[PDB]
Amino acid sequence: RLPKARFIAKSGACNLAHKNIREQGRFLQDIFTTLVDLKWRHTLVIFTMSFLCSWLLFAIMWWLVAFAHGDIYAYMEKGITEKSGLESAVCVTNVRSFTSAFLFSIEVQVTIGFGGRMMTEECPLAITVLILQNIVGLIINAVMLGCIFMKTAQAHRRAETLIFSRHAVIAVRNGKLCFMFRVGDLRKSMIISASVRIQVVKKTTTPEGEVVPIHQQDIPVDNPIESNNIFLVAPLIICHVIDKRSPLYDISATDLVNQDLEVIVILEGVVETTGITTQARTSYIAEEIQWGHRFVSIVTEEEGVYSVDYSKFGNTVRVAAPRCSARELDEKPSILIQ
Amino acid sequence: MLARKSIIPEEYVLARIAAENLRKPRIRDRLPKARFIAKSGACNLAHKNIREQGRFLQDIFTTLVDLKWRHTLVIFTMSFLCSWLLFAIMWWLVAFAHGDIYAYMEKGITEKSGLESAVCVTNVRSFTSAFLFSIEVQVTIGFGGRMMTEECPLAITVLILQNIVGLIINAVMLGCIFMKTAQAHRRAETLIFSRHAVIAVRNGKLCFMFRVGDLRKSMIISASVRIQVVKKTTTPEGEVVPIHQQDIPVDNPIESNNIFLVAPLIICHVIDKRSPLYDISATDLVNQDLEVIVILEGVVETTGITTQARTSYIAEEIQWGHRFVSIVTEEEGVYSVDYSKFGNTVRVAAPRCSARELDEKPSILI
Ligand SMILES: Nc1ncnc2c1ncn2[C@@H]1O[C@H](COP(=O)(O)OP(=O)(O)OP(=O)(O)O)[C@@H](O)[C@H]1O
Ligand SMILES: Nc1ncnc2c1ncn2[C@@H]1O[C@H](COP(=O)(O)OP(=O)(O)OP(=O)(O)O)[C@@H](O)[C@H]1O
Ligand SMILES: Nc1ncnc2c1ncn2[C@@H]1O[C@H](COP(=O)(O)OP(=O)(O)OP(=O)(O)O)[C@@H](O)[C@H]1O
């Protein structure tokens, strides 16, 4: 039926729905930012279209400025008269058609300037138009150059690359139940200063009466040294041991599948090749937690080097796990201990 | 040609030293060795049978940005030459079709005409001229003895197409050059490690020590030291953890994992109960399947890039009973260190028992 709520999905990307946020209006800086945040298939198109539109716009202006002076009349009557009676008076030499104005604009801005179409020193309006057009062309070229530099810089990153298991396990390890999951890497480099944090999502209350709605917490990931940095070259099985103080201690075994909990995993680090800090997220819910199972080993010795095979990443076989809550194993040994 | 037609000689006699020498072992171990990471970085694992994700052209561009400086110039030059040539051929075909080549040849064979009033693209007469006109249009030179009259609109289309593509080429190549010039400090990493490891006696318990130093005149900031032991174990309930990496404390005055790296240092590691080195003895520590990894992290203030340096130790290289010679020495007016005494180790009084028992038998004597 209607889906029961999750906090963050099976592919990260927190599903929260902020609503009625007090928003301000438009900051055109946001539009420019969209300009730099683009796809190449569209960046190339707008890049070309800017130049095409600019040339056409200044071509129409150039035709008008060739219209104002006595230019078109002179070049239309010279053909009839076949007389060189218009040698020097014209405003922009040999500009006599909208096509010719368009060609002159192309010549002037990309700095081609073939030089058969000279620009005299007479019509001040024309000199104003030339100054304006040259400045606009310089600005446009600089902006697009900046766009290309940002594109090249943001080329290297492709997509998130740290991979978490289909589901997790809850095994028995060293005389106390432990929550385990599997994390792997697909990169060529390795993640510097990697860190892993685990959280328990549960709707909670406080004994004195306050109400906490989607409260977070944190569960102590274990190392023999009480520290959280982890080095990831082989696929790893992150583990967390159940103590009396984690909220993952009073749950039962059979009745986990019908129980309101969520386990969020956050893995951060800094990539060595390009030096960009990254954070990858995932979550496990009640429906996708297989109690009492355990992961099979995947690293073996191939007589030349160690060898692992991620094709067998998510397979998980069931082995022994006592049918009691992780509390019953310590409050009353005779209840569980055997 | 048919070397061994006469096949008759078979099983007459061989009867020889092939393995029945009896004074030489028949076996040939051949001594192959596998370590978790090579002695000089380059983690050597074996990923295979991974569900592949195909390829995408953005990866080709990503390769374009990451090239050695002796290939960027080559791809630059090839790109420029190919572009000029391609548009030269387009211009040559345009000149051919519109009847310009014939007009120029016929009216220049006899100079009587001098007619250039009806031509598609003036003063293009050969492929040489077309491959000099395309030069004058792409690089924004514009020599201008060859105007483009306004008539033939196909030529104008070609000019628009070529100018825009030329700008694209110029912008992309400038971007590549700038990106490679900005990230030009980033040569490589030059962290120097001692190779041999001692287990001396100091401060009432054993140790685990080596030496590390830099070469760049910039010291490394927020340097952190991590030491791990690689071994295969199983749960008491019996599950194969294939290559368990166990973290072990590196001692320090306040138990924190930063180190300040200016003069080379000893990196101690006191063996205590939790440490996996509790159970290793003198004659034992030549035979063992263990690999101790060391991970050094920091940033270099000059380039502003985070760096991670890796090395690996095996039980075979580690030589019990030694320590490191005091490389430093107060000189005439200023301290100094001779890195030439890097791998040099000396021997001194070394107990031969295990730290497992160096508290069990409570006599500092062994
Ligand atoms: N919805 C919101 N959007 C943006 N900023 C907010 C929002 N709510 C609170 N803030 C920030 O918190 C502070 C709230 O102070 P303020 O005195 O405006 O509270 P308030 O608006 O009276 O609260 P309420 O409207 O809920 O009664 C402000 O500085 C504001 O920047
Ligand atoms: N060998 C592999 N090669 C490439 N990607 C992998 C590999 N193993 C796992 N992944 C990635 O890790 C994620 C988790 O895979 P997992 O094995 O946990 O799920 P799964 O049930 O095997 O998924 P599927 O049913 O699609 O095979 C997947 O989305 C997948 O993209
Ligand atoms: N003066 C030095 N310059 C550069 N590297 C050094 C120097 N001294 C030692 N090393 C490093 O120490 C590591 C061990 O090398 P090796 O065992 O061949 O020499 P060593 O005994 O440590 O020192 P030496 O060669 O001075 O006797 C090498 O990786 C090497 O790079």
mmCIF file of C-alpha atoms in Angstrom, chain B residues 35-359:
data_model
loop_
_atom_site.group_PDB
_atom_site.id
_atom_site.type_symbol
_atom_site.label_atom_id
_atom_site.label_comp_id
_atom_site.label_asym_id
_atom_site.label_seq_id
_atom_site.Cartn_x
_atom_site.Cartn_y
_atom_site.Cartn_z
ATOM 1 C CA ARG B 35 53.244 -8.711 -0.579
ATOM 2 C CA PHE B 36 50.129 -6.669 0.193
ATOM 3 C CA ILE B 37 51.703 -3.519 -1.279
ATOM 4 C CA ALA B 38 55.037 -3.216 -3.057
ATOM 5 C CA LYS B 39 58.060 -1.784 -1.298
ATOM 6 C CA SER B 40 57.660 1.478 -3.269
ATOM 7 C CA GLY B 41 53.948 2.289 -3.145
ATOM 8 C CA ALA B 42 51.768 0.762 -5.840
ATOM 9 C CA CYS B 43 49.305 -1.320 -3.844
ATOM 10 C CA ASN B 44 49.321 -4.675 -5.632
ATOM 11 C CA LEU B 45 45.916 -6.274 -5.230
ATOM 12 C CA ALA B 46 43.888 -8.140 -7.866
ATOM 13 C CA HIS B 47 40.469 -6.814 -8.778
ATOM 14 C CA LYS B 48 38.797 -8.906 -11.480
ATOM 15 C CA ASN B 49 35.370 -10.101 -12.648
ATOM 16 C CA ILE B 50 33.881 -6.697 -11.748
ATOM 17 C CA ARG B 51 30.638 -5.713 -13.459
ATOM 18 C CA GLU B 52 31.979 -3.193 -15.963
ATOM 19 C CA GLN B 53 30.305 0.165 -16.580
ATOM 20 C CA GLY B 54 31.276 0.611 -20.232
ATOM 21 C CA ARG B 55 32.917 3.834 -21.386
ATOM 22 C CA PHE B 56 31.854 7.374 -22.232
ATOM 23 C CA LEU B 57 33.456 10.074 -24.347
ATOM 24 C CA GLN B 58 33.857 12.309 -21.328
ATOM 25 C CA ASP B 59 36.532 9.852 -20.265
ATOM 26 C CA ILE B 60 38.346 10.499 -23.557
ATOM 27 C CA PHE B 61 38.308 14.198 -22.786
ATOM 28 C CA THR B 62 39.488 13.423 -19.251
ATOM 29 C CA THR B 63 42.444 11.663 -20.822
ATOM 30 C CA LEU B 64 43.045 14.673 -23.054
ATOM 31 C CA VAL B 65 43.590 16.883 -20.026
ATOM 32 C CA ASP B 66 46.035 14.435 -18.352
ATOM 33 C CA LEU B 67 48.955 14.173 -20.793
ATOM 34 C CA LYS B 68 52.709 14.521 -20.589
ATOM 35 C CA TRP B 69 54.031 17.838 -21.881
ATOM 36 C CA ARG B 70 55.731 16.183 -24.858
ATOM 37 C CA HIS B 71 52.357 14.989 -26.172
ATOM 38 C CA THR B 72 50.198 18.064 -25.592
ATOM 39 C CA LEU B 73 52.311 19.975 -28.108
ATOM 40 C CA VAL B 74 51.910 17.144 -30.605
ATOM 41 C CA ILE B 75 48.127 16.951 -30.267
ATOM 42 C CA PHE B 76 47.950 20.760 -30.399
ATOM 43 C CA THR B 77 49.923 20.891 -33.647
ATOM 44 C CA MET B 78 48.037 18.011 -35.239
ATOM 45 C CA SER B 79 44.693 19.606 -34.352
ATOM 46 C CA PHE B 80 45.692 22.919 -35.872
ATOM 47 C CA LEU B 81 47.072 21.406 -39.069
ATOM 48 C CA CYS B 82 44.090 19.133 -39.592
ATOM 49 C CA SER B 83 41.657 22.000 -39.114
ATOM 50 C CA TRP B 84 43.449 24.262 -41.580
ATOM 51 C CA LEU B 85 43.682 21.480 -44.143
ATOM 52 C CA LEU B 86 40.042 20.418 -43.858
ATOM 53 C CA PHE B 87 38.728 23.889 -44.384
ATOM 54 C CA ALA B 88 41.200 24.448 -47.197
ATOM 55 C CA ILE B 89 39.686 21.491 -49.036
ATOM 56 C CA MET B 90 36.192 22.851 -48.444
ATOM 57 C CA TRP B 91 37.230 26.226 -49.850
ATOM 58 C CA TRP B 92 38.910 24.597 -52.837
ATOM 59 C CA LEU B 93 35.741 22.716 -53.724
ATOM 60 C CA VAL B 94 33.683 25.885 -53.371
ATOM 61 C CA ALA B 95 36.066 27.714 -55.684
ATOM 62 C CA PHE B 96 35.881 24.854 -58.203
ATOM 63 C CA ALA B 97 32.110 24.647 -58.418
ATOM 64 C CA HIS B 98 31.199 28.313 -58.764
ATOM 65 C CA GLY B 99 33.245 28.652 -61.935
ATOM 66 C CA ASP B 100 36.027 30.729 -60.419
ATOM 67 C CA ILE B 101 39.022 28.562 -61.312
ATOM 68 C CA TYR B 102 38.081 28.465 -64.987
ATOM 69 C CA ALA B 103 37.449 32.202 -65.077
ATOM 70 C CA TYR B 104 40.819 33.056 -63.554
ATOM 71 C CA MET B 105 42.743 30.621 -65.757
ATOM 72 C CA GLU B 106 41.096 31.790 -68.984
ATOM 73 C CA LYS B 107 41.337 35.517 -68.255
ATOM 74 C CA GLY B 108 44.894 35.285 -66.950
ATOM 75 C CA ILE B 109 46.249 33.182 -69.792
ATOM 76 C CA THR B 110 45.452 36.310 -71.822
ATOM 77 C CA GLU B 111 45.790 39.384 -69.578
ATOM 78 C CA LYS B 112 43.397 41.380 -71.791
ATOM 79 C CA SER B 113 40.356 40.951 -69.540
ATOM 80 C CA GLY B 114 41.349 41.907 -66.001
ATOM 81 C CA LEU B 115 37.848 40.965 -64.820
ATOM 82 C CA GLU B 116 37.112 40.218 -61.149
ATOM 83 C CA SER B 117 33.551 41.564 -60.982
ATOM 84 C CA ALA B 118 31.823 38.140 -61.036
ATOM 85 C CA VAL B 119 33.664 35.611 -58.850
ATOM 86 C CA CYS B 120 32.606 33.641 -55.805
ATOM 87 C CA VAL B 121 35.730 34.194 -53.688
ATOM 88 C CA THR B 122 38.311 36.564 -55.152
ATOM 89 C CA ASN B 123 41.942 35.575 -55.675
ATOM 90 C CA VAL B 124 41.504 31.896 -54.873
ATOM 91 C CA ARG B 125 42.914 30.103 -57.887
ATOM 92 C CA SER B 126 44.625 26.890 -56.786
ATOM 93 C CA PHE B 127 44.772 24.532 -53.869
ATOM 94 C CA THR B 128 47.901 26.373 -52.715
ATOM 95 C CA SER B 129 45.978 29.607 -52.584
ATOM 96 C CA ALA B 130 43.078 27.899 -50.851
ATOM 97 C CA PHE B 131 45.498 26.525 -48.263
ATOM 98 C CA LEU B 132 46.834 29.995 -47.692
ATOM 99 C CA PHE B 133 43.418 31.657 -47.572
ATOM 100 C CA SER B 134 42.228 29.205 -44.972
ATOM 101 C CA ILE B 135 45.263 30.243 -42.961
ATOM 102 C CA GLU B 136 44.335 33.860 -43.368
ATOM 103 C CA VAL B 137 40.851 33.194 -42.050
ATOM 104 C CA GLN B 138 41.414 30.796 -39.144
ATOM 105 C CA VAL B 139 44.231 32.503 -37.223
ATOM 106 C CA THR B 140 42.617 35.923 -37.596
ATOM 107 C CA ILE B 141 45.552 37.054 -39.722
ATOM 108 C CA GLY B 142 43.451 38.341 -42.583
ATOM 109 C CA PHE B 143 46.011 39.264 -45.197
ATOM 110 C CA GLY B 144 43.254 40.616 -47.354
ATOM 111 C CA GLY B 145 44.473 40.327 -50.846
ATOM 112 C CA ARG B 146 41.597 37.850 -51.041
ATOM 113 C CA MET B 147 38.305 39.430 -50.051
ATOM 114 C CA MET B 148 35.063 37.483 -49.968
ATOM 115 C CA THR B 149 32.588 39.190 -52.219
ATOM 116 C CA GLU B 150 29.014 39.039 -51.071
ATOM 117 C CA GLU B 151 27.389 36.906 -53.735
ATOM 118 C CA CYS B 152 27.795 33.157 -53.417
ATOM 119 C CA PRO B 153 26.006 32.309 -50.161
ATOM 120 C CA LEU B 154 27.617 28.883 -49.896
ATOM 121 C CA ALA B 155 30.940 30.572 -49.293
ATOM 122 C CA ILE B 156 29.386 32.700 -46.548
ATOM 123 C CA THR B 157 27.997 29.594 -44.880
ATOM 124 C CA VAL B 158 31.443 28.036 -44.968
ATOM 125 C CA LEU B 159 32.953 31.161 -43.392
ATOM 126 C CA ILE B 160 30.484 31.146 -40.505
ATOM 127 C CA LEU B 161 31.009 27.435 -39.894
ATOM 128 C CA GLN B 162 34.778 27.721 -39.970
ATOM 129 C CA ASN B 163 35.084 30.817 -37.818
ATOM 130 C CA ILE B 164 32.973 29.269 -35.080
ATOM 131 C CA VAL B 165 34.776 25.922 -35.159
ATOM 132 C CA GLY B 166 38.123 27.685 -35.075
ATOM 133 C CA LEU B 167 37.046 29.609 -32.001
ATOM 134 C CA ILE B 168 35.987 26.352 -30.336
ATOM 135 C CA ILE B 169 39.406 24.844 -31.063
ATOM 136 C CA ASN B 170 41.247 27.883 -29.743
ATOM 137 C CA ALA B 171 39.195 28.000 -26.541
ATOM 138 C CA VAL B 172 39.592 24.309 -25.757
ATOM 139 C CA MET B 173 43.330 24.320 -26.378
ATOM 140 C CA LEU B 174 43.833 27.437 -24.264
ATOM 141 C CA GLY B 175 41.877 25.734 -21.497
ATOM 142 C CA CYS B 176 44.075 22.662 -21.637
ATOM 143 C CA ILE B 177 47.251 24.736 -21.476
ATOM 144 C CA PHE B 178 46.012 26.803 -18.531
ATOM 145 C CA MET B 179 44.854 23.759 -16.584
ATOM 146 C CA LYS B 180 48.195 22.046 -17.071
ATOM 147 C CA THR B 181 50.041 25.244 -16.100
ATOM 148 C CA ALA B 182 48.092 25.765 -12.864
ATOM 149 C CA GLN B 183 48.592 22.209 -11.602
ATOM 150 C CA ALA B 184 52.296 22.359 -12.361
ATOM 151 C CA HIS B 185 53.654 22.279 -8.823
ATOM 152 C CA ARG B 186 52.287 18.748 -8.506
ATOM 153 C CA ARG B 187 55.384 16.828 -9.566
ATOM 154 C CA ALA B 188 55.272 13.702 -7.375
ATOM 155 C CA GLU B 189 55.856 12.510 -3.803
ATOM 156 C CA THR B 190 59.337 12.148 -2.312
ATOM 157 C CA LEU B 191 58.937 10.683 1.169
ATOM 158 C CA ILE B 192 61.991 8.613 2.138
ATOM 159 C CA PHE B 193 61.564 5.593 4.410
ATOM 160 C CA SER B 194 64.081 3.460 6.196
ATOM 161 C CA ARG B 195 63.856 -0.105 4.942
ATOM 162 C CA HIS B 196 65.019 -2.216 7.886
ATOM 163 C CA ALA B 197 63.190 -2.388 11.203
ATOM 164 C CA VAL B 198 64.690 -3.069 14.606
ATOM 165 C CA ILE B 199 63.180 -4.430 17.809
ATOM 166 C CA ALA B 200 65.394 -2.838 20.449
ATOM 167 C CA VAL B 201 64.931 -2.616 24.211
ATOM 168 C CA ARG B 202 63.889 0.728 25.655
ATOM 169 C CA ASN B 203 61.943 2.039 28.640
ATOM 170 C CA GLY B 204 61.374 -1.397 30.116
ATOM 171 C CA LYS B 205 59.663 -2.975 27.096
ATOM 172 C CA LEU B 206 60.442 -3.802 23.483
ATOM 173 C CA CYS B 207 59.707 -1.581 20.504
ATOM 174 C CA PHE B 208 59.173 -1.489 16.747
ATOM 175 C CA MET B 209 61.104 1.294 15.051
ATOM 176 C CA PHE B 210 62.136 2.698 11.657
ATOM 177 C CA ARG B 211 63.121 6.048 10.143
ATOM 178 C CA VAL B 212 61.340 8.497 7.842
ATOM 179 C CA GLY B 213 62.340 11.807 6.298
ATOM 180 C CA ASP B 214 61.592 14.304 3.568
ATOM 181 C CA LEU B 215 63.525 15.976 0.835
ATOM 182 C CA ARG B 216 61.448 19.017 -0.163
ATOM 183 C CA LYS B 217 62.411 22.103 1.827
ATOM 184 C CA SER B 218 58.713 22.404 2.717
ATOM 185 C CA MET B 219 57.738 20.415 5.797
ATOM 186 C CA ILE B 220 54.412 18.590 5.742
ATOM 187 C CA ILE B 221 51.486 19.873 7.801
ATOM 188 C CA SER B 222 49.151 17.884 10.058
ATOM 189 C CA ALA B 223 51.135 14.749 9.378
ATOM 190 C CA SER B 224 49.548 11.597 10.751
ATOM 191 C CA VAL B 225 51.070 8.159 11.307
ATOM 192 C CA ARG B 226 49.038 4.977 11.175
ATOM 193 C CA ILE B 227 50.425 1.489 11.686
ATOM 194 C CA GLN B 228 48.529 -1.689 10.959
ATOM 195 C CA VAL B 229 49.193 -5.423 11.087
ATOM 196 C CA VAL B 230 47.966 -7.637 8.251
ATOM 197 C CA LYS B 231 47.216 -11.248 9.089
ATOM 198 C CA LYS B 232 44.559 -13.868 8.432
ATOM 199 C CA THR B 233 42.422 -14.741 11.424
ATOM 200 C CA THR B 234 39.109 -16.397 12.108
ATOM 201 C CA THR B 235 36.373 -15.851 14.621
ATOM 202 C CA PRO B 236 36.358 -18.267 17.564
ATOM 203 C CA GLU B 237 33.102 -19.332 15.908
ATOM 204 C CA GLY B 238 35.269 -19.799 12.810
ATOM 205 C CA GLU B 239 34.868 -17.398 9.889
ATOM 206 C CA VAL B 240 37.664 -16.639 7.427
ATOM 207 C CA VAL B 241 38.528 -12.961 7.522
ATOM 208 C CA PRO B 242 40.803 -13.141 4.511
ATOM 209 C CA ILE B 243 43.371 -10.375 5.220
ATOM 210 C CA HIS B 244 42.443 -8.733 8.477
ATOM 211 C CA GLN B 245 44.014 -5.319 8.974
ATOM 212 C CA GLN B 246 44.358 -4.476 12.660
ATOM 213 C CA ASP B 247 45.084 -0.964 13.860
ATOM 214 C CA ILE B 248 47.751 -0.586 16.504
ATOM 215 C CA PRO B 249 48.606 2.463 18.609
ATOM 216 C CA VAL B 250 51.790 4.355 17.821
ATOM 217 C CA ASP B 251 53.108 5.686 21.070
ATOM 218 C CA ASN B 252 53.315 9.411 21.728
ATOM 219 C CA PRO B 253 53.423 11.760 24.723
ATOM 220 C CA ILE B 254 49.611 12.164 24.778
ATOM 221 C CA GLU B 255 48.500 9.189 22.639
ATOM 222 C CA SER B 256 47.675 11.079 19.437
ATOM 223 C CA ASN B 257 48.671 10.208 15.905
ATOM 224 C CA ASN B 258 50.245 13.420 14.616
ATOM 225 C CA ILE B 259 53.983 13.733 14.009
ATOM 226 C CA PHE B 260 56.112 16.788 13.164
ATOM 227 C CA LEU B 261 58.515 15.932 10.357
ATOM 228 C CA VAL B 262 61.685 18.019 10.106
ATOM 229 C CA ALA B 263 64.525 15.938 11.338
ATOM 230 C CA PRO B 264 64.133 12.184 10.785
ATOM 231 C CA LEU B 265 62.505 10.259 13.581
ATOM 232 C CA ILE B 266 62.058 6.941 15.319
ATOM 233 C CA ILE B 267 58.442 5.743 15.198
ATOM 234 C CA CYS B 268 58.042 3.571 18.267
ATOM 235 C CA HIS B 269 55.234 1.097 18.840
ATOM 236 C CA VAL B 270 55.148 -0.420 22.315
ATOM 237 C CA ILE B 271 54.099 -4.072 22.251
ATOM 238 C CA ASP B 272 51.299 -4.619 24.735
ATOM 239 C CA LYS B 273 48.458 -7.050 25.337
ATOM 240 C CA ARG B 274 46.108 -5.849 22.608
ATOM 241 C CA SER B 275 48.922 -5.611 20.071
ATOM 242 C CA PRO B 276 49.235 -8.623 17.739
ATOM 243 C CA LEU B 277 52.987 -8.521 18.334
ATOM 244 C CA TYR B 278 52.553 -10.030 21.787
ATOM 245 C CA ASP B 279 53.383 -13.547 20.598
ATOM 246 C CA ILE B 280 56.550 -13.402 18.458
ATOM 247 C CA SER B 281 59.976 -14.640 19.598
ATOM 248 C CA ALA B 282 63.529 -14.356 18.336
ATOM 249 C CA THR B 283 64.050 -17.557 16.359
ATOM 250 C CA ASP B 284 60.367 -17.368 15.440
ATOM 251 C CA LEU B 285 60.641 -14.050 13.600
ATOM 252 C CA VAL B 286 62.138 -15.440 10.429
ATOM 253 C CA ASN B 287 59.191 -17.774 9.733
ATOM 254 C CA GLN B 288 55.774 -16.081 9.728
ATOM 255 C CA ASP B 289 53.016 -14.990 7.328
ATOM 256 C CA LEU B 290 52.582 -11.365 8.395
ATOM 257 C CA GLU B 291 52.650 -7.983 6.707
ATOM 258 C CA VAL B 292 52.879 -4.733 8.658
ATOM 259 C CA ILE B 293 51.688 -1.660 6.771
ATOM 260 C CA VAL B 294 52.607 1.948 7.538
ATOM 261 C CA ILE B 295 50.467 4.834 6.278
ATOM 262 C CA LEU B 296 51.690 8.447 6.368
ATOM 263 C CA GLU B 297 49.354 11.362 5.658
ATOM 264 C CA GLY B 298 49.786 15.088 5.367
ATOM 265 C CA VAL B 299 49.650 18.184 3.208
ATOM 266 C CA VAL B 300 52.453 20.164 1.578
ATOM 267 C CA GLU B 301 52.117 23.872 2.249
ATOM 268 C CA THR B 302 53.586 24.945 -1.077
ATOM 269 C CA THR B 303 51.323 23.164 -3.542
ATOM 270 C CA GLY B 304 48.385 22.799 -1.157
ATOM 271 C CA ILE B 305 47.694 19.167 -2.086
ATOM 272 C CA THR B 306 46.951 16.368 0.363
ATOM 273 C CA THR B 307 49.441 13.492 0.102
ATOM 274 C CA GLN B 308 49.380 9.891 1.334
ATOM 275 C CA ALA B 309 52.544 7.780 1.342
ATOM 276 C CA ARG B 310 52.489 3.986 1.662
ATOM 277 C CA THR B 311 55.100 1.326 2.399
ATOM 278 C CA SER B 312 55.087 -2.307 3.485
ATOM 279 C CA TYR B 313 57.085 -4.516 5.853
ATOM 280 C CA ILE B 314 57.333 -8.307 6.023
ATOM 281 C CA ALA B 315 58.680 -10.460 8.818
ATOM 282 C CA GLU B 316 61.570 -11.527 6.570
ATOM 283 C CA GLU B 317 63.194 -8.067 6.360
ATOM 284 C CA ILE B 318 62.857 -7.275 10.066
ATOM 285 C CA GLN B 319 66.085 -8.059 11.933
ATOM 286 C CA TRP B 320 65.762 -8.604 15.685
ATOM 287 C CA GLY B 321 68.302 -7.265 18.121
ATOM 288 C CA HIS B 322 69.290 -3.960 16.540
ATOM 289 C CA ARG B 323 68.698 -0.229 16.811
ATOM 290 C CA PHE B 324 69.459 2.815 14.675
ATOM 291 C CA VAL B 325 72.719 4.728 14.812
ATOM 292 C CA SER B 326 72.330 8.291 16.015
ATOM 293 C CA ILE B 327 72.494 9.928 12.592
ATOM 294 C CA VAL B 328 72.568 13.442 14.056
ATOM 295 C CA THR B 329 75.646 15.026 15.624
ATOM 296 C CA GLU B 330 76.172 18.491 17.070
ATOM 297 C CA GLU B 331 78.397 20.045 14.409
ATOM 298 C CA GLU B 332 80.677 23.077 14.643
ATOM 299 C CA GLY B 333 77.855 25.598 14.755
ATOM 300 C CA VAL B 334 74.593 23.981 13.682
ATOM 301 C CA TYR B 335 72.944 20.578 13.863
ATOM 302 C CA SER B 336 73.175 18.300 10.855
ATOM 303 C CA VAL B 337 72.048 14.882 9.673
ATOM 304 C CA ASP B 338 73.767 12.558 7.201
ATOM 305 C CA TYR B 339 71.087 10.543 5.413
ATOM 306 C CA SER B 340 73.939 8.267 4.314
ATOM 307 C CA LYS B 341 73.493 6.439 7.614
ATOM 308 C CA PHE B 342 69.825 5.758 6.813
ATOM 309 C CA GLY B 343 69.701 1.967 6.501
ATOM 310 C CA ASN B 344 72.647 1.504 8.838
ATOM 311 C CA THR B 345 71.744 -0.421 11.994
ATOM 312 C CA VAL B 346 73.876 -1.566 14.920
ATOM 313 C CA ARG B 347 73.486 -4.403 17.400
ATOM 314 C CA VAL B 348 73.272 -4.047 21.171
ATOM 315 C CA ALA B 349 72.108 -6.134 24.136
ATOM 316 C CA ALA B 350 68.837 -7.717 23.031
ATOM 317 C CA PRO B 351 66.784 -10.175 25.094
ATOM 318 C CA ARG B 352 65.805 -13.283 23.136
ATOM 319 C CA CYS B 353 62.507 -14.063 24.864
ATOM 320 C CA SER B 354 59.004 -12.959 23.898
ATOM 321 C CA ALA B 355 57.338 -9.887 25.380
ATOM 322 C CA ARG B 356 54.570 -12.390 26.067
ATOM 323 C CA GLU B 357 56.942 -13.627 28.775
ATOM 324 C CA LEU B 358 58.888 -10.419 29.405
ATOM 325 C CA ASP B 359 56.266 -9.753 32.075
#
